[PDB]
Amino acid sequence: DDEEETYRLWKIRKTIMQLCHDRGYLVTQDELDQTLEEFKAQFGDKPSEGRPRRTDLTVLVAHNDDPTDQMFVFFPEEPKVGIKTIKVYCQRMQEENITRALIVVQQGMTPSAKQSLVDMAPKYILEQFLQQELLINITEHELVPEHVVMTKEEVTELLARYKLRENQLPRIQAGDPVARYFGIKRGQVVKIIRPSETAGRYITYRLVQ
Amino acid sequence: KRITTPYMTKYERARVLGTRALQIAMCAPVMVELEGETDPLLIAMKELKARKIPIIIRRYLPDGSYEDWGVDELIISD
Amino acid sequence: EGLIDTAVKTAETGYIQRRLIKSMESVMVKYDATVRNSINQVVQLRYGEDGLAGESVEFQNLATLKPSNKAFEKKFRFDYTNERALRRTLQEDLVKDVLSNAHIQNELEREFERMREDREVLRVIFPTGDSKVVLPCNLLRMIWNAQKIFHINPRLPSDLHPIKVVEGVKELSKKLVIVNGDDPLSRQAQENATLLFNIHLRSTLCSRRMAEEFRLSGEAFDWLLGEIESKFNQAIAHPGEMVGALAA
Amino acid sequence: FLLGQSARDAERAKDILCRLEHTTLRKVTANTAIYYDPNPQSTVVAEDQEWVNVSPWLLRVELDRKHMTDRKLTMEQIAEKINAGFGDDLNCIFNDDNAEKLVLRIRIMNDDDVFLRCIESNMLTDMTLQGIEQISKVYMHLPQTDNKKKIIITEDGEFKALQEWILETDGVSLMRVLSEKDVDPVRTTSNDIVEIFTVLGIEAVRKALERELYHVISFDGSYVNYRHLALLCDTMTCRGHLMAITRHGVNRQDTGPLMKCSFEETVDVL
Amino acid sequence: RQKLLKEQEEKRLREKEEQKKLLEQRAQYVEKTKNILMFT
Questions:
Q1: Which positions ≥6 away from C80 have C-beta within 8 Å?
Q2: Minimum-distance CB partner of E25 among A28, A70, A95
Q3: Where are the alpha helices (DSSP H) in chain A?
Q4: Quick check: C31 and B11 CB within 8 A?
Q5: Does domain A137-209 have CATH number 3.90.940.20?
Q6: How far apart are CA D201 and CA D206, in angstroms?
Q7: Homologous superfamily of A1-136 in CATH?
């Protein structure tokens, strides 16, 4: 197709913006809710060998409070990206002081490449997303409550009021879709605000692991 | 800084009364006047109403601490 | 068919109940008032998310959910401007205090803004507009016990200052403690665990319903508040209670 | 749950239903007759159509009409999927959408005889003309109760249940469905708590599991307190994955061997 | 009424904070678009 790929490209980019806005980064309220028309007018409305070609709708956004903390959101054109393809993505992240990134593959990357994501891990955090999972914002679903990632100062205050070792909280595993939305890593507590029908609201905490 | 509930839960009342009545039946000196009865559970219940059971309750907390509460300190429920 | 299904039912459900009890037998309510298991991993932070046992809750109705934005106002609002209507409800030496005093009038207006905010909360908690809720104290039977105990006569004008209601409910919301503590983390959760009961309490013990509808005297109102808290404090889950064995 | 204007009219909700149900060629096809017609202009049949378009064996495939329309398909898309699925090793010569018979013609071009049979069976069972897989069939209901009716606070504060069209499938994908347009990606639930877990999360499985558990309990009118369902759905989802209530869910928990030997297996764990 | 006017002007202050944040994001996008360009 040509029209359907523009629709999908725009929906993916919108969900990426709502992600980078929830992860804490800085996105303008215009880029947050732009509509499909000015997405057509902005790039080319022609992905079938045209102007909104991928690796041109990529985005850089800097963190909200630390203006040196940036994150790329790349868009590979290889449906099945390889090691030789993320090697170059990481090769030109090194020209900057950017560490975080985000790869939106078209089909799964190769298991040969996923190691290069953990081998480069402590020095350059990057993560993948299939473009299929990004077609919707799952934090909008009505079953998914609200997730708030707690800061290290307040995890200690939580473990200290309940006198509770971090080993005794409920868990959420790192590959959870909502844990990968917020990009929490292991050993990081998530606050969850649930509407309760017997009490009205319930706040529960889950340790990533 | 005792933080537990100030009410005698219903499990503590069962165990305090059973234990106090065992101690009374083994000839322990009663803390209350007997208006003329002889069953040890009726006596232990009378003593509980007079808040004169000489027992304290050590409430372990899950981290390992504990709090002792005299029986005359907490509010008897039934 | 009924005789066949009875004989397969008996043996197929008796195994569900056994798998459930083995999976949940050691979950219980600690003196921490938190719900943990044998490894002391915390399962729920309060029993049932509100900290109350099930033998004492009842079925009530939320009044401020689903009237409409005008029926809510002409029922939970307490105008202090109509002078004729207040001599019908309040006695003569209270209708000047609410008709002149701007402190009392700011207080009464602020209370209605609080009810109006609780209303939006409720509409995000119970969408689909489902008024029936389960909650500890039966307030409307307590009000009715109060009218029969102090002989209310809802035909005479009452002597209950509309502000004694406003401030007595503020002082009662304090004595219903579920999460004890002065910590911010603990005040937040005490505020959450008693959020639906506090909304119900503030929506049936209004200043306006207590004067146009229940007609409680002052003495009956003190009895009523002592009764509400004494029942709430009986509803709290006892520590030691084996709740996973009940759930199974 | 349908999103926009599709939620009201049964006409614009019906093509959603078509865009979700699995249609292969076998549902639209009627008769498959391979032939050894050598000279493509010779056409052992009565068809003047090839003679306007211009290997010796074909697959005359005559389609169905009341099955081709009730899913609203044209021969251009079948012809396009028919070469996109097999590439340029074939040359479909479709009819027009004026004739009475809906005939396709395939020919190979580049153990040769059986090959049109070999590809006419892989193309017949599965060619997925239109829809997503695992969805076998999709009903279409208008809700009668207030349980699936849309509820909407009006502009005066009343609640006001709206009556919209909803779908109701038979297989499960849930990720390819939420992404479809004119499909509410907010209220499209799934009845399948292992589907929800890999899509939505572990905190969504807890809400879904309790809604399932409460549906199967209150179906017959009875009522179980809520405390007891929250606690079961909390122990099942407390360690971050779905812990079944079987010997593989609760014995893998680290409770200590004297407690696991009491449930099952009794010596294998000792 | 005066309190209503002060709350409205404060909402205008938050609008202006939005204006400065938007100019800020646009201001760094010109520096950054250079990095999406030189990246490829």
A1: C86, C98, C99, C104, C105, C108
A2: A28
A3: 3-22, 29-32, 36-42, 83-91, 111-119, 152-161, 177-182
A4: no
A5: yes
A6: 9
A7: RNA polymerase, Rpb5, N-terminal domain (3.40.1340.10)
